[model samples]
Target: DEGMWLMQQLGRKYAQMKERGLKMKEYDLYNPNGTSLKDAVVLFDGGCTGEVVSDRGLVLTNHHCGYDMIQAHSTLEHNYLENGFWAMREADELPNKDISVVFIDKIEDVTDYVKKELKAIKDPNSMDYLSPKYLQKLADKKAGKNFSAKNPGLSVEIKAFYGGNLYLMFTKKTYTDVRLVGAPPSSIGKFGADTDNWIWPRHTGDFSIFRIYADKNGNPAPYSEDNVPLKPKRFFNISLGGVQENDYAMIMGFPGTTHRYFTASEVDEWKSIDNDIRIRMRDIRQGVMLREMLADPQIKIMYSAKYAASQNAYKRAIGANWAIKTRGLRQNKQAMQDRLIAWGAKQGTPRYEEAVHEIDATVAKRADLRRRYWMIEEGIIRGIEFARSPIPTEDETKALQDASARKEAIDKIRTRYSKFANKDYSAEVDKKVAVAMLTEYLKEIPYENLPLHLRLVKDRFAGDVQAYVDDIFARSVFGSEAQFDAFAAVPSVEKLAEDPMVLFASSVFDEYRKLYNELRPYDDPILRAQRTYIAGLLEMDGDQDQFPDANLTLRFTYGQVKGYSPRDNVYYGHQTTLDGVMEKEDPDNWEFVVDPKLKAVYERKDFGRYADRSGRMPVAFCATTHTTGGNSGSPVMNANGELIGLNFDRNWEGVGGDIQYLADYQRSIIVDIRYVLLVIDKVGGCQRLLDEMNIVP
Candidate 1:
């Protein structure tokens, strides 16, 4: 009921699954010799999850998961983001260069091998013990140099689990030629927008469609004219069977990082350093973005994705804080540490005590440095776009000096410039956000810690943040398109060194690197102690096979599709209907605005066979499965391993589940699979896709 269990460890949960109502054999979920449901679940891009729903490689993921891809292909001429997109014919599918899907073909215990390798270095504090690069090198050696040649599109990575107490190797096959298949308009895909995000009783149609393309031989290949839709080894059967309360449910996908092993001190650090800074800084930036977006339609389109991402991160912080304050999340994390600490004292090892003490002490030692680091990150790097403009490195400086390499250097600068100053960028918005960000940064960060160029504000501009930023916008070559284009035409080292924005970026990153290095000294001790601490916990528990924390690897979780009383008086139903969507509509607001096509479908009662037994259109449902951020787009299957929904979000009230799963309070918000079919069949009119899926009645 509370595990992001690895697929390789599915046997641990099988007995419980059968007790709950899993009708399928354990091998049906994950089989070592043949294709299983595990083959259908994929890691969408690097951050989200998706599932192959058709034998022809049709991937169904959350629309917001593919929001950037949708936005990238969007233009005012044919706004696929605003007015949905459907590849009515094979020729019409849009190829995307920046996106890819990963199928984890194999996973095995590399813990003994990893420990044997690290045994040569007895330095307990060396971070190489937990280094992904070193571990990945080991994975590569095991897989061999010709792994990709041996198995096309396949590669290997090693990930640390349970705070580096265990390591596992994951061999994945990545498909690069993913394309845009279809998406409902944002009005439906992101119906609630910021307002309905993270809340339950939601009726958002939060799904998108894509297809994997491969070479003519059905092997992974880059985009080409001859490529065809991939023939996947496995895909889910889309069931028309309606959802109900107390039905068995299971989800398999790549659940991203979780800190279920966190101590109370770690929770406190997460709250103050990570969550609070994000919420505070984002509030300042989002306020400015929203004001400008509301005033200008052009700006709205330009910064829509930026604002949406900012809002999403902000709400997650807020939700976590709410859970911490109200739902005993901190208390739960503390209890685990308290129990383990007691066991350590009893056993005379005292590793857990030392681990907890050192973590707290180290966190205290670097508190000021961490705040400054986060301020610079949220204020400069995140809030101000121009702060990311590229500057030549020390070697590149030699390139700029020599006439032979100078052209290549200038070409690189131009390439960087185009991306930094693209169509979605607005100098005015950048200036405004910079002003707001710099003001807060100056107020919070000590003058001694300010980047060298930023000190100019006090010495030269008399502390006027607006005037300092205005000067940068006016004089910096990286400030405007024309100025940068002219600089691109006649590039020089003098101009490169003297550009205000270049100096600004240089100073900021230099200070950033310094702070990062200073912080590194504190991390090794924490890492060493956590590994020792968790190892002892494993020993005390009598087995090291406890469900490990998620690290963006394929995992399985199971529970029931049931509802809960979020509070004293509110017992929310297990599912939402199309009626909920209609009731929540408001044309005055863009987010809640219903599409005319959708309205017509609802009016005509065109739900077809997708309707529930009650003859209503089911839009979404809630389940008791333990899920987190990267679970988005994970297919939620019934007891028979049939696709019933795709988990999209967690209710705001249970956000603390990332640290500690609450059986009564936590619920995974899932968009009903039947609703996705309805949208494709009725609203999108993409019967070709409907015909592709193996739909069951």
Candidate 2:
């Protein structure tokens, strides 16, 4: 229930699965030698998880995971986030230029190759360590000689797992012809918003539909009118059977990161400094954006996805800090370290004995520096002028095709990008937030370490952050799309340097790099110490069950449907129904308002076959399955390996589970498949989608 295990190791885990009620054979899940379920799942946009659920390559994922694509397709005329959408015909599917999906064809253990290379270098653990570019080159060469020769056009790369202790070569194929097929309005998809995000008993229908297209022969290809629905080698069969308590459940997808093995010092720093600063800063930022969003509809549509993405992490950090303190995670971690040190003493290994001390020393040394760095990052560096500035296009680059073509191409590209950046941008709101952010930066970071531009703000503007921000925005090209476009029409490096926004960003970024370089000396040692600590633990507990920390790699976690009591008197049921959604509806609040059609269905008890035995439609359910950020949209399968739900969130009380799992309180929240189907069929009135899927009851 921890590591994203390599597919090649499925056979070894299969032995334990029988006792857990898995009916499928190891080969049925992942067999590099043949077709299996591995063929269906893909890394969605190199981040979230998704799976093909039908022969026609209908891909399903969490609505929020698809929010950016949905927002990109949305406008004042066609607001899909407000009104739901569906593709009645294949030709009507909206193509997404930036959205793509990758399928892992095969994986090879390349530990020996990487270790051999590292061993050849002096002080292999130092900063002069092998770069990702070097590793990719080696991996590509090996893959070309092995898998790519057999299956042409596949992309290959190597990734380090278990904190650089293990290496694996992954070969995958990417399909760029992904198109949006269906989605529920934000009312249903994002239900409770920040209030319900990480909170359990969820009633959100957080699923969206997309389809993969391929060439006539069903191979991955770029977008084209001639492309046809991809015929996937394997796809999930939907289970309308629903779930029961204690039923075997499994989540298979990419999980981004976890600090399950972090030392007490690291956890303390994270809780006290990193998470706290992020939460505080984002709270201010989100408040400004939300007020502006509510005041304007066009701005709302444009910033909907951005706001959600920002708040997702903000709320998680808040919950994480609260959970860590309340759960006494620091004390618990310290206790574990005490035990490990005692155990290390018995082992008589010098590396094991000194590992914890080395880690603690580095943590102590960098804690203040890390805190100061993040304050600047969360404050000034991420300010609107710096973080949200317009980026130059290829035509704006130094090596232009020709001097004659540069201006025309630069104007065209610049005008296009200027609109892209300014569409959701509000000068008034940004100015207010920027002033507030700069105030925090000056208040928090010491004067000696402050960015050069911020020092100028103090010396030139009588230390008034608001006055400085007003001056910067007044003269900067970034003040408006028109101004930026005009400047881009005839751009030069010297001319660019004159803009206050660019100058400010350059100063802030340069300062950040300088501070990072100062802290760089601590990084390699801390990493080396962590590697040593983990390796020692592995050796000390060689016979015990364990999982590696998450690294955005595909993995499988198995558990059972379960519920928990967050407090002495508050017991949460494993599942929540449509009745709860209706009860929670607040018509005046957009975050909780129920869609009229959905309310009508609930009132009429018109759930059809999607209803449970009690005649209620399940909205969401929770299980003990482990998950994290990138697990959003991962498929949660039943004992028979049929899709039952889509993994999207975690109960707020278990937010600390990222660092340490509290089985009794931790639960992965899933949108019930029945609800997803009900929305797609009854609410959306999309019979074409229902007809394409293979449903099993």
Candidate 3:
């Protein structure tokens, strides 16, 4: 593609010209003013460009970040993506209504503030072993007579690191006065769908735009008649000069969560079983959902949004699966184990293999049983819900319900297990549910360990399982609004089986509840034998480094723009071009299409005489920044801290970046900020926005 070759050529030239200006590391990461890691910082939030480019309060962020809010207020007539949208005047800026653009106002090192208390405590197995509890306890003591008393409503977050270190990240988030700016229709925004979702060398321009709001004093406020564009502390400049191969870029935003640290057993378990089941279930549903939505307009309206969400989830699973398989997550995990095992042998290790054997045995056995139950039923339609609403205590439920009502103004909010409320009647979802319920068997426990009731149910209902399923439950959750209303009224039994909704809910819900109580504490001989291996590793590997574990918390990882090959003679590059989009223009394929206007651009071939030797047409674009599900809406920044691209999807070859980030395959796809500006300025005709954005020539 002429556009891509031109971008690369310009990128090379610019890199050479500017390389002298920056003292960068091998990854091209650099600090403006030669600042340290502490100063070369990032804001921790869902994702956004926190800085302001002008006196006006125009903000920049990844389109995926803005998608939920935009879709919330969107209609077919005012389709922001199809025709593009822009606020021509300050008054034209749309209010998010219930949404907020959050910023990390300040990050303070509170290591001593937290560690001093941890040092005072002796127990390592307590709840406060590694958490905000230690910090919060201290904060309570110091705030008794301090000025913090005056700021009662200010929110505070204490992040824990390495089981001991801590820091307080102060944030200021605005929840209103945000509105849609510009977004390409699904033809552009969700171009590749699942076929091209995570696997890259991609050509989807997945991006969206939104703004922020505040009062004259710059404080947070409710929807107001007098609110104005918020002047953020800083924002990114819109650059028209697009990027090329090896062009330096960095993503700075709040990465929602990660599991960089995990035990070898956990890695093995995820790679061997859990991850595959998850991907299979998601891919199956997404594949079917897309077909149904594309075939019917009403279905499209009702399920398209859900399909988009599922597509995102499916891609994440695909990426993670590929990451585990290709990036050698299993191998790395095994290697870590080998090192520990060998060290234990040298030490004449007592109880060395015991822990590993135990954990592995428990993992393998439990995993088998879990697969039998979880994969067939829970894995299909309501897997997300199953995982979210593990039985909660009375206090937890009341607290969560209250929180739900407060955030309910944003309809996307839901109780984790409540997803059964949004049931899909499509065959795709039903097939997954059927497979999970009927085909699976408990692999961990021997045939002898079967509970009498489950065995009886299996024997009696094995032939006509759905019928048996209907026979077992009293009230189904999905029958109607009345069914859910009734379920809500019940205190002990939150759901019943006679209702359709309750039936769907109970299949996964009841099993999960039973499993939590029944199989969670496995005492099999296999685990008893493997416990030695885990203990060995723990004993040999000193406490200097923290063992990786999945504790849901915000974490960040950094890498560079580079490419790798998965197989022989298939070297993967770090970019994609517009021509890729043109090749994928079959409307029948829900993932690829060209709107009438975009089609016009292609027809004009206005690439302006910049074709490479082979001659391809650059239709859309891509990048080499490692990203994943939580990384959506992360701002891709240039060395000057300017927004260059909105990190969205990854190439097919780069899907393995999650488990083991490779310089070759790990990439973060971005919608070039220039393109965003072009659509806003030329297509949307938001001239006032063009004037306000500080768009670079």
Alpha-carbon local distance difference test for all models: 0.87, 0.82, 0.50
Per-residue CA lDDT of model 3 for 1-697, tens digit only, reads 0001111122233454256332334223322233222122233133433333444556555555566666766687887645555656666666665565554443455657665766665754344634466656655564454434465324455555432323343423434555565566666676666666666566766666555566777666666868776665454566555555565666544443334434466677665666676666666555655566767666666666666666665556666676676667767767776677677677786465555665676776687666554453435334333222223334544443434542332222224334543544333333333334333333332334443323434566664545544443324433334643454544323332123333334344555566666655674443334334433443566322322221223222333455567678987666556656677788775567676676665567544332233443332344444455555555666555455666666565554444454555556666666555545544456667667776555
Q: Rank order by TM-score, top first?
A: 1, 2, 3
Better of 2 and 3 by TM-score: 2
True-structure RMSD, every candidate:
3.6, 4.5, 8.8
**lDDT, candidate 2, residue 509?**
79
Steric clash pairs (candidate 2): 4-555
Span of ten consecutive residues with least summed lDDT in model 2: 392-401
Our tally of clashes for model 3 stands at 71
Cα lDDT tens digits, model 2, 353-402, are: 58789989998998877887888777766645345464444446563435
Model 2, residue 21: distance off in Å is: 3.6
Please give the ranking of all candidate structures by lDDT, highest first, separated by commas.
Answer: 1, 2, 3
Q: How many residue-pair clashes does candidate 2 contain? A: 1
TM-score of each: 0.88, 0.85, 0.71
Reference-based TM-score, model 1: 0.88
Per-residue lDDT of model 1, residues 1-697, tens digit only: 2878877677766887899999999887899778888889889988899999998999999999988888889999989899989989978989897788999888888889998988888675678877878888888888897787888888888988877777888888888999999999999999998889889999999999999999987778999989999998899999998788899999998888777777788888889888888889999999999899999999999999999888887888888887777777778768767888898888887768888888789888999899888889988988989889878778667887746687787778878888998999998998899999889999998889999999999999999988988898788788887888888787778888888899999999988889899888887877777787778777777332356887888888889988899879989989999999999999999989998998888989888999999889999999989899899999999999999999999998778788877788789999999999999988899999999999988
Over 4 Å off in model 2, which ranges? Answer: 1-4, 8-12, 72-79, 126-130, 146-150, 284-310, 383-436, 456-507
